Amino acid sequence: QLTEEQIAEFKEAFSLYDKDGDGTITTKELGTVMRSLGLNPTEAELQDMINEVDADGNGTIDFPEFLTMMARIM
Template sequence: MAVPEEAEIHEVFKLFDQEGSGIKIKEIGTVMRSLGLAAPEAQLREFVAEAAKKDSNHVQFSDFMGYVRRAQTMEADKSVDVAKEMQGMKNGIGHFFDKLSHKQIRENPPDMVKIADIKHLLSSVGEKMAEEEIEEMAREIRNSCRIQDGRVSFDDFVKMLQA
């Protein structure tokens, strides 16, 4: 989802602020989610605690905008971290296939690797990946590599990892 502009944020805020006195503190998370922001529960609790110090019941738009910007910054930072983790993982898998597994995993035809073996490695070797991450990698493989009988072209796989 695209980053919401201040005008869009204000429109959504007004939908929840029917009386013009601000949104209820307990609705901070709901309003953020309606904007497409997925602030973690810990961060939402922090926002609620800060808002409660100013007013026990409501949050004004200017304060809410501050919370939105902080949530957006956190999401952007998380995206950068995930990208770095994915690149590290790709490098590690490429190294593993290049150095360790030629005889163990590669089968006839010799330039193809079973997708199931790749998934097994991702879930059991080194830092284990979550099922979601494994499926995301499998989708990327299916979208970027030649596949035949459940096997992926080893050369295509290596190129994908190096991209």
């Protein structure tokens, strides 16, 4: 049962990571969110996190890939 409200909240969450609005999440953008949680990862640690959900091999996180991260934390 997929609603427009569901889609809107997912969009809101993606947008919190994708600050510059170009549709992909970079290590810089991931780092800003993790440091706000209280963590302090290195650049390489941030790339190992992307590598985990990077289903198309392009090095950064896109919308469907972000959706699988959300599915795992729920």
